[PDB]
Amino acid sequence: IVGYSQNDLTSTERLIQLFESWMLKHNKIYKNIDEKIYRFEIFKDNLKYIDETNKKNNSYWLGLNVFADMSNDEFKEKYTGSYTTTEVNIPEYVDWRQKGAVTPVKNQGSCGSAWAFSAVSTIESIIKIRTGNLNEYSEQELLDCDRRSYGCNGGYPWSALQLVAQYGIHYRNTYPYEGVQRYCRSREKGPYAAKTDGVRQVQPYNEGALLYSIANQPVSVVLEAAGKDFQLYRGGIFVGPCGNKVDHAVAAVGYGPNYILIRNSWGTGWGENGYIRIKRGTGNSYGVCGLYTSSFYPVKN
């Protein structure tokens, strides 16, 4: 499903009703009417692009997902959705969701905080893996408190992970997400909920290395997410196009023969209920969309 029937494309009235329908599906309410008209125009143009691109025989398809009313210029201006990131025998299949080690898909909103979401996801997972309990921890805390990062203007998964190793992290409910950087309120919220024992880097530009890490636990990884095809991604195995100018952090929560399974922080209305399967095995040392550029995971004894 791509969000529309071809009958929807046969007149301006149907297109409009389709847009109306899509707004409802995604709980979109606009500032004023001039906004709604502008949004319909963008929506119409992305639909044309979606329709023409899905005609071709590619291994993935696009769709009227949650970003269908945004121009790529707008989507890409902060780079990364709603510069999130700045500068031996393993199973055939791995999927940590199946082991109860992955929390429900989150939404970073209009804040370039994916570095924190990426880090928190891997911490949530390794604490489950080590202790048996799946908890939700605070992205907001890392957003506010990681002094090496830049809040909603982007940051570093490795710094966020280091903070949790050295100090700790509070529960989500204790320090909920606001999508805006405020002052660090860690000390106000009492004792930490969890604390890891360190951080490791996967050897970069090495697919086998990353797969091995994923087989042991979810891994924080980065990729170039700013492209229009990535923005409008609906499902299937993503082969590109994308360059190596990584700009966004995500979590690698699994893999299969042909892909790496990627947890994004753009909510469930993007991609495969929040996930994307990125092509692997192309021999290309960068990885597709530069996926092998910079990967870190938490250590928990």
Interface with Na ion by CB under 5 A: which residues?
Answer: 240, 242, 288-289
Q: How far apart are CA 122 and CA 296, in angstroms?
A: 9
The minimum distance between CB 289 and Na ion, in angstroms, equals: 5
| Gaps in the chain after residue (C–N beyond 2.5 Å) | 82, 87
Asked if 230 is part of the footprint of Cl ion (rule: CB under 5 A), the reply reads no
Classify residue 27 as left (phi > 0), alpha (psi -120 to 50) or beta. Answer: left
Mask for 238-277, x = binds Cl ion (CB under 5 A) = ------x---------------------------------
Our CB check for Na ion shows the closer of 64 and 246 to be 246
Would you count residue 292 as binding Cl ion (CB under 5 A)?
Answer: no
The number of residues that bind Cl ion (CB under 5 A) is 2
- Quick one: 198 or 236, whose CB is closer to Na ion? 236
- The β-bridge relationship of strands 233-238 and 60-62 is antiparallel
Name the residue with the smallest CB distance to Cl ion: 286
Query: Nearest approach, Cβ of 292 to Cl ion (angstroms)?
Result: 9
22 interface partner picked from Cl ion, Na ion, none, CB below 5 to 8 A per type? none
Q: For residue 179, which amino acid is it?
A: G
Q: What residues form DSSP beta bridges with 260?
A: 255, 278
Beta-carbon contacts of residue 151 (< 8 Å; ≥ 6 apart) = 111, 113, 143, 144, 181
Nearer to Na ion, 19 or 230 (CB): 230
Tokens of 177: 């997400």
Rounded to whole angstroms, the Cα distance separating 294 from 286 reads: 10
> With DSSP H G I counted as helix, E B as strand and the rest as coil, what are the percentages for the chain, rounded to 5?
35, 20, 45
Q: Which of 61, 177, 286, 292 binds Cl ion (CB under 5 A)?
A: 286
Quote the least distance from Cβ 293 to Cl ion, whole Å.
Answer: 9
CB of 1 to Cl ion, least distance (A): 28
> Where does this chain bind Cl ion (CB under 5 A)?
244, 286
